[PDB]
């Protein structure tokens, strides 16, 4: 969910600011995996609302999308989601997607599953 | 700026209750999200576009949102729709009511009492109940598909398109055929236990809207002391989560029981006789009665629909009128959704949305949902709490029990 994820982001950012003894936070850059089905606008808005009434208020939030990369183990071949997209895409791939080369369905997600904060701007 | 990596742990709606050796310690729930986002984005957008955006909120009641939205818009611009198109709107709405109620009651409430899990179609039982549920679902969805097209047919000032009279006659026939099924539903839900799977019976203010012959559409609030259109208090309590609402300073409940309690005398037809027969069962002090109440509303809304259909035939040729957008219109439409009273508030300026406030019935029901967790048991308690929750018919839910 958008609001839950946004809550996680806000909590983490505020925690980092507390640890660093930050007087104020001004900018946060978050990297979202495209396998997340969340909508960037809702998440950003939610973050803005939760950011109210704290040191990290009125902060500028930037979202960077990390492409999804899959590595089939059997043939040992890597491909990207964009290659399969050309024919919602994100959720629960394991069900439908397989390697373009193998009849396998067995693969590991290397990039694009997780969400992490890549940058934080602190004012002390 | 300075790059870092801090991982966001999202192991991951639901209701959480924490219990102890000394008794229950805490109970809180975050089951729905604020519509604030929509209220924020539609500002400055065209009225049509906003009306297209609004039904995205709580998609389960897809139809209702659209209808109340356009109602609010019309009330803003000063347009008052004809009685025929209004009746048709109420018919589509009735379809949504039938679908929502039937699906909810049968697919959610019955397996709880009879203890079923997994696939809900089985030989040894439930064939007939599912036949009824599926027939009602098909009927409502078919009405929604015939008078709606999200609802593309629902437009400001009228309808996009309107079908032939033949399909309306066939609709009347199908409704009349659907009446005894709804009756069987009411009878079936009459026998099941209320206030228990530990009675949760207590004092509870119910809130509804009042319409002269029915409870579908209205322009007046329906509690013990009525108001035409007013903003009740709203409170922001966070688990750590939507905003809760308090009427007259206290939590209140909305749903079928509210319509019955407040507007009982307005009913007629078979549902009136049934209400008079089992008036004790649909009492104002219990949540589970809502389920049964919903069943009653099936029969009523079935028969009512027929009447409404006839009203549409009072004028044999029908055409969707056109309206002009006007500034300064502020329109507050308090409608009644299968979940409860749905509130839409639209202020239009220069043909664009200047103010939007939307309140979903589940927001209303959430305070009393938190209140009515006076369920004491030793785990099975999860199941009971789940039943209590499902009595309020939220969009989705799940229960988690935790010790210490
Ligand atoms: Zn392969």
UniProtKB/Swiss-Prot annotation, chain A:
Name any Gene Ontology BP term.
protein modification process
Known Gene3D superfamilies for this protein?
A: 3.30.2320.80
Give the molecular function GO annotations: nickel cation binding; zinc ion binding
Q: Which UniProt keywords apply?
A: Metal-binding, Nickel, Zinc
Q: InterPro entries under this entry? A: Hydgase_Ni_incorp_HypA/HybF_CS, HypA/HybF
Family, similarity comment? Belongs to the HypA/HybF family.
Q: What does this protein do?
A: Involved in the maturation of [NiFe] hydrogenases. Required for nickel insertion into the metal center of the hydrogenase.
What is the name listed in the Swiss-Prot or TrEMBL entry for this protein? Answer: Hydrogenase maturation factor HypA
This chain's source organism reads Thermococcus kodakarensis (strain ATCC BAA-918 / JCM 12380 / KOD1) (Pyrococcus kodakaraensis (strain KOD1))
């Amino acid at each position: 969910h958008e609001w839950a994820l946004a809550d996680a982001i806000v909590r983490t950012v505020l925690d980092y600011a507390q640890r660093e003894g930050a007087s104020r936070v001004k900018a946060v850059r978050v990297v979202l995996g495209e396998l997340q089905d969340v909508a960037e606008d809702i998440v950003k808005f939610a973050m803005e609302q939760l950011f109210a009434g704290t040191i990290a208020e009125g902060a500028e939030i930037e979202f960077v999308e990390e492409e999804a990369v899959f590595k089939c183990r059997n043939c040992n071949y890597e491909w990207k989601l964009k290659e399969v997209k050309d024919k919602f895409i994100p959720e629960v791939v394991h069900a439908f997607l397989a390697c373009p080369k193998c009849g396998s369905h067995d693969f590991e997600v290397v990039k694009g599953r997780g969400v992490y904060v890549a940058g934080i701007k602190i004012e002390k | 700026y300075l790059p870092i990596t801090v991982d966001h742990i999202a192991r991951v709606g639901g209701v959480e209750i924490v219990v102890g050796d000394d008794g229950v310690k805490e109970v809180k729930l975050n089951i729905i999200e604020g519509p604030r986002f929509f209220e924020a984005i539609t500002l400055g957008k065209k009225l049509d576009e906003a009306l297209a955006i609004y039904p995205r909120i709580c998609s389960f009641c897809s139809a209702a949102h659209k209808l109340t939205a356009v109602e609010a818009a019309e009330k803003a611009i000063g347009f008052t729709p004809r009685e025929e198109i209004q009746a048709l709107r109420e018919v589509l709405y009735i379809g949504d009511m039938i679908e929502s109620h039937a699906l909810h009651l049968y697919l959610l409430v019955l397996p709880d009492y009879l203890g079923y899990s997994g696939p809900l179609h089985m030989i040894d039982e439930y064939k007939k109940e599912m036949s009824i549920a599926l027939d009602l679902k098909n009927l409502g969805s078919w009405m929604m598909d015939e008078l709606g097209s999200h609802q593309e047919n629902a437009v400001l000032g009228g309808f996009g398109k309107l079908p032939d009279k033949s399909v309306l006659e066939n609709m009347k026939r199908r409704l009349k055929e659907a009446l005894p099924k709804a009756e069987y539903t009411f009878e079936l839900f009459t026998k099941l236990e209320q206030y228990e799977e530990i009675t949760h019976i207590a004092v509870k203010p119910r809130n509804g809207v009042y319409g002269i012959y029915g409870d579908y559409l209205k322009a007046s609030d329906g509690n013990e002391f009525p108001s035409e259109e007013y903003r009740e208090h709203i409170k922001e309590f966070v688990v750590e989560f939507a905003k809760h609402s308090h009427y007259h300073g206290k939590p209140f409940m909305v749903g079928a029981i509210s319509r019955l309690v407040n507007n009982a005398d307005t009913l007629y037809g078979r549902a009136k006789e049934l209400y008079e027969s089992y008036k004790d069962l649909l009492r104002s002090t219990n949540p589970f009665a809502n389920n049964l109440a919903q069943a009653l509303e099936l029969v009523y809304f079935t028969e009512r629909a027929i009447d409404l259909i006839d009203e549409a035939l009072a004028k044999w040729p029908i055409r969707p009128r056109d309206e002009v957008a006007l500034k300064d219109g502020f329109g507050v439409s308090t409608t009644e959704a299968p979940r409860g009273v749905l509130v839409y508030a639209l202020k239009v300026e220069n043909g664009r949305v200047s103010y939007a406030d939307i309140i979903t019935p589940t927001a209303f029901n959430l305070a009393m949902m938190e209140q009515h967790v006076r369920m004491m048991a030793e785990k099975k308690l999860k199941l009971l709490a789940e039943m209590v929750v499902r009595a309020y018919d939220p969009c989705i839910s799940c229960s988690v029990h935790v010790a210490r």
